[PDB]
Enzyme design. Structure first.
Site, PDB file in Angstrom:
ATOM      1  N   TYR A  82     -68.575  -1.980  45.585  1.00  0.00           N
ATOM      2  CA  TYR A  82     -68.222  -0.485  45.348  1.00  0.00           C
ATOM      3  C   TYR A  82     -69.250  -0.295  43.869  1.00  0.00           C
ATOM      4  O   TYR A  82     -68.890  -1.649  43.123  1.00  0.00           O
ATOM      5  CB  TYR A  82     -66.541   0.151  45.038  1.00  0.00           C
ATOM      6  CG  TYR A  82     -66.057  -0.465  43.888  1.00  0.00           C
ATOM      7  CD1 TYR A  82     -65.650  -1.445  43.750  1.00  0.00           C
ATOM      8  CD2 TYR A  82     -66.487   1.144  42.722  1.00  0.00           C
ATOM      9  CE1 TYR A  82     -65.236  -1.759  42.302  1.00  0.00           C
ATOM     10  CE2 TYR A  82     -65.658   0.827  41.468  1.00  0.00           C
ATOM     11  CZ  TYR A  82     -65.512  -0.601  41.511  1.00  0.00           C
ATOM     12  OH  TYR A  82     -64.902  -0.782  40.069  1.00  0.00           O
ATOM     13  N   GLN A  90     -62.364   1.626  32.023  1.00  0.00           N
ATOM     14  CA  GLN A  90     -60.944   0.722  32.552  1.00  0.00           C
ATOM     15  C   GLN A  90     -59.751   1.165  31.342  1.00  0.00           C
ATOM     16  O   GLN A  90     -59.273   0.797  30.787  1.00  0.00           O
ATOM     17  CB  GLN A  90     -60.990  -0.617  32.041  1.00  0.00           C
ATOM     18  CG  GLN A  90     -62.007  -1.427  33.608  1.00  0.00           C
ATOM     19  CD  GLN A  90     -62.257  -3.005  33.344  1.00  0.00           C
ATOM     20  OE1 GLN A  90     -61.778  -3.409  33.060  1.00  0.00           O
ATOM     21  NE2 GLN A  90     -63.600  -2.401  34.667  1.00  0.00           N
ATOM     22  N   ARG A 108     -55.981 -12.125  36.475  1.00  0.00           N
ATOM     23  CA  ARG A 108     -57.309 -11.496  37.026  1.00  0.00           C
ATOM     24  C   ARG A 108     -58.253 -12.429  37.410  1.00  0.00           C
ATOM     25  O   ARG A 108     -59.349 -12.460  37.779  1.00  0.00           O
ATOM     26  CB  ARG A 108     -57.472 -10.483  35.951  1.00  0.00           C
ATOM     27  CG  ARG A 108     -56.652  -8.658  37.363  1.00  0.00           C
ATOM     28  CD  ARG A 108     -57.564  -7.956  37.114  1.00  0.00           C
ATOM     29  NE  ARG A 108     -58.769  -7.816  35.895  1.00  0.00           N
ATOM     30  CZ  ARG A 108     -58.043  -7.158  34.650  1.00  0.00           C
ATOM     31  NH1 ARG A 108     -56.342  -6.578  34.081  1.00  0.00           N
ATOM     32  NH2 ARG A 108     -58.108  -6.885  33.881  1.00  0.00           N
ATOM     33  N   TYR A 165     -60.696 -13.742  40.851  1.00  0.00           N
ATOM     34  CA  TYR A 165     -62.256 -13.986  40.265  1.00  0.00           C
ATOM     35  C   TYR A 165     -62.858 -14.883  40.642  1.00  0.00           C
ATOM     36  O   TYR A 165     -63.562 -14.645  41.244  1.00  0.00           O
ATOM     37  CB  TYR A 165     -62.590 -13.017  39.004  1.00  0.00           C
ATOM     38  CG  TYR A 165     -62.040 -11.167  38.123  1.00  0.00           C
ATOM     39  CD1 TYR A 165     -61.974 -10.842  39.122  1.00  0.00           C
ATOM     40  CD2 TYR A 165     -62.300 -11.099  36.997  1.00  0.00           C
ATOM     41  CE1 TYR A 165     -61.178  -9.476  38.857  1.00  0.00           C
ATOM     42  CE2 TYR A 165     -61.718 -10.102  36.872  1.00  0.00           C
ATOM     43  CZ  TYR A 165     -61.697  -8.642  37.194  1.00  0.00           C
ATOM     44  OH  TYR A 165     -61.203  -7.976  37.159  1.00  0.00           O
ATOM     45  N   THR A 197     -62.538   6.644  33.521  1.00  0.00           N
ATOM     46  CA  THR A 197     -62.722   6.385  32.080  1.00  0.00           C
ATOM     47  C   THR A 197     -62.755   7.543  31.155  1.00  0.00           C
ATOM     48  O   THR A 197     -63.031   8.583  31.917  1.00  0.00           O
ATOM     49  CB  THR A 197     -64.575   6.611  32.964  1.00  0.00           C
ATOM     50  OG1 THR A 197     -64.983   5.617  33.709  1.00  0.00           O
ATOM     51  CG2 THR A 197     -65.385   6.125  32.049  1.00  0.00           C
TER      52      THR A 197
END
Lengths: 262, 68, 262, 69
Positions: free
Chosen positions: C92, C166, C66, C70, C235
Site C-alpha cells: 500500500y 506511526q 517486528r 520484516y 498520522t
C-alpha cells in the site's frame, strides 16, 4: 461547473494514477502544465480540449513577476469553471506539492460556490526516494524551498535527509529570472556551513521524464555547488551530517535505556 | 518516437523487453540510428530536436519562497 | 528472477499508477501488503498468483519482534526471485516511504546479482496535502517516525508543518505491541511542549481506503492527544507554532532587504 | 456486489462524479442493500467489512520502526 486538479507524475504516460487519467479523459476542458512535447502530445491524444498554462510564463525576455503568472493561471482555470465547464487542471508531479496554482484555484472556486477538489499524484520527492533507495523515515526528512531557506529563518535538523527544492533559483529575490547566480549559491553554501562541513557530500537530483532516460544523480562536495550545472527542475539533497543520538531525558521518563530497545 | 515513448512508459511488458535489449526494441519500433544514438548518450535535447518541437518552452516552477 | 516493488496508493483500485498496475498484471507472482479485503480481492482479480505478506505479522497474541516479521517478509520475496520468478512486491502507499521491506529486498536482490527496482507510489503524506489543502513548500515540511522522535534527539522547526508518523505506537520500544498507552503519549505531549503550547491545535489524519469513505481529519488541542482514539494508520500533523520571520543576516549578505522581495 | 461496486467507483471518474451528485441513487442502482447504504452514510467501515464477508481479515499496516540500525 466544477474543478478537479490532478497530477501526471514525472514520467511520461505511466506514472499518472488510474482514476486521475479517467478524470482527464472525461473533462470538458483541461488546463495543462507538463514537462515536454511528448507529454503534451500524450495529453492531447487523451483529451483534445487543452489550454496550455505554459503561455502565462514570461515570453521573449519580458520582465514578469511569477506571482502575476500564477494569478493569470488561476484566473484562466476559474474562467472555465465560472462558464459551466467540467474543468480539470493537469499538472506534472503532485498538483499540490511545491505548486500554489491548484491550492489557489480550489480555494477561489469553493469561495464562489463551485465543487473543487485535488487528487494526489507522484511528486519529484516520491521519485527521489525510489531512485536513491532512501526511506524518509530512516532518520526523518525535511523539505524547504531553497530561497525561503535563505530569506526567512529556518533551522535544519542535521540527522535527517534535507531537501532544498528549486535550488536553480536560490536567492533570486525578484521572482522575474529563471536561474540564480554562482555568488548567490556561494552565500547559500556559507549559510549551510552552520550545520554541514564544506566537504560534505550532497546530491543534485533530477527525476527522469522519459522512459528511456536515467535520472540525474550527481554527487559532489557542498563547496562545489556554486560551480555545478543546475536546471529549474533540480533539487538538492543534503544527507545527514550526524548519526542519531540517544535522547536520555525521554528514555528515563519512559523508564528504559538503549539496551531495552527492540 | 512519441508513439513508442508513450507505449513504453505505460506497458510493463514492453518496458521489460526494452530493458533486456534497448537497441533491438528501439530498432524494431522504427527509431533511426541518430535517435538511438541520442538515447544511448542521454541527449534529451537532440531527442526533442528529432521529434520536432520548436523547442517547446517548458519552465516548470509553480511556487516561490518570498511568502505571502 | 527479477524484482519490482510497486505501491498501490491508499484508495482502492484507482490510486495505483498505470505502469505499476501493468507490472502487477504481468508478474509471475505477487507479494501483497494491502489495507483490507476489498483491496485484496481487487489484486487477486488482477493476478491470481498472490502471497499475502500479512501472515508474517504476529498472530493470536504471539510475542514477535517486528524486525523478525520484516526479515521473514524479505526472505519470502527473495525466495521467489532466487527460484527464477518475475516477482512483484505490491505494498500500500509508496513502497519505499516509511517501509523498510522493499529497500531491504532490493538491496539483497542486487547483492545476489538479480535485477531489482522500486516504482514510486502515492503515500499517506501525498494524500494529506491534497485532503487538507496544504502545500509542504508553503513554510516547509518535516517528517519523523514518532518513536524515533522520542528515543533519539530530533529538533523540529516550528515554522514548518511537522508530521509524526506511526503516532499510535509512539514510545512502544519492544516492537511487539500494536499500540502504545496513554502515559507514553502524555510524555510526548510534554516533550513537544518545548516548542508548541499545550492549547496548540493539532490534526489526527487518516487517509481513506475506500471511495465511499471520507478521510479522518480530527482537530484537537495538543493537550488532549493522550485521550484521542488512534489507529495504526494515524498520522499526527502539527501545524506551525510561528510565522516566517525575515533572515536579516542573509538578506544583508545578498545586499537586499524585505522591501526588495518580489 | 459490494466489492464490485467499490472497485468500479474507485477507478471510473464518470461513476465517481455521478456518485458525488447522488450517492443514494447510485448505490441503489448498483444493488446495495439498505443496511449497506446506511453503513456508508454513517461512515461505519467495520460493518461494510462484515457485510462483504471479509470478517477477520487481519490488516496491520506498519512496515517500519523508530529503533534504528
Amino acid at each position: 461547473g466544477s474543478l478537479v486538479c490532478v497530477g501526471t507524475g514525472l514520467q511520461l504516460a505511466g506514472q499518472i494514477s488510474v482514476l486521475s487519467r479517467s478524470y482527464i479523459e472525461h473533462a470538458d476542458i483541461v488546463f495543462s502544465l507538463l514537462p515536454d512535447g511528448f507529454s503534451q502530445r500524450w495529453l492531447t491524444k487523451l483529451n483534445p480540449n487543452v489550454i496550455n498554462l505554459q503561455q502565462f510564463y514570461a515570453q521573449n525576455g519580458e520582465v514578469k513577476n511569477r506571482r502575476d503568472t500564477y494569478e493569470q493561471m488561476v484566473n484562466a482555470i476559474l474562467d472555465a469553471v465560472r462558464a459551466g465547464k467540467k474543468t480539470v487542471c493537469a499538472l506534472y508531479g503532485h498538483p499540490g506539492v511545491f505548486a500554489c496554482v491548484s491550492h489557489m484555484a480550489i480555494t477561489r472556486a469553493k469561495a464562489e460556490g463551485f465543487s473543487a477538489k485535488m487528487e494526489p499524484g507522484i511528486s519529484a520527492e516520491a521519485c527521489l526516494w525510489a531512485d536513491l533507495g532512501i526511506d524518509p523515515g530512516n532518520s526523518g526528512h525535511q523539505s524547504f524551498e531553497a530561497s525561503q531557506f535563505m530569506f526567512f529563518n529556518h533551522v535544519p535538523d542535521p540527522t535527517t535527509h534535507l531537501l532544498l527544492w528549486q535550488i536553480a533559483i536560490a536567492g533570486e529575490h525578484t521572482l522575474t529570472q529563471f536561474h540564480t547566480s554562482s555568488d548567490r549559491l556561494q552565500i547559500l553554501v556559507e549559510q549551510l556551513n552552520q550545520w554541514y562541513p564544506l566537504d560534505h557530500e550532497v546530491v543534485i537530483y533530477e527525476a527522469a521524464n522519459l522512459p528511456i532516460q536515467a535520472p540525474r544523480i550527481e554527487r559532489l562536495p557542498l563547496a562545489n555547488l556554486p560551480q555545478a550545472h543546475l536546471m529549474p527542475i533540480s533539487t538538492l539533497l543534503i544527507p545527514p551530517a550526524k548519526k542519531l543520538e540517544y535522547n536520555y531525558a525521554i528514555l528515563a521518563k519512559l523508564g528504559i535505556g538503549p539496551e531495552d530497545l527492540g | 518516437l512519441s508513439d513508442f515513448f508513450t507505449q513504453l512508459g505505460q506497458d510493463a511488458q514492453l518496458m521489460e523487453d526494452y530493458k533486456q535489449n534497448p537497441e533491438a526494441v528501439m530498432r524494431a519500433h522504427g527509431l533511426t540510428d541518430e535517435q538511438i544514438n541520442a538515447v544511448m548518450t542521454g541527449d534529451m535535447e537532440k531527442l526533442k530536436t528529432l521529434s520536432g518541437d520548436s523547442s517547446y518552452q517548458s519552465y516548470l516552477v509553480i511556487s516561490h519562497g518570498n511568502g505571502d
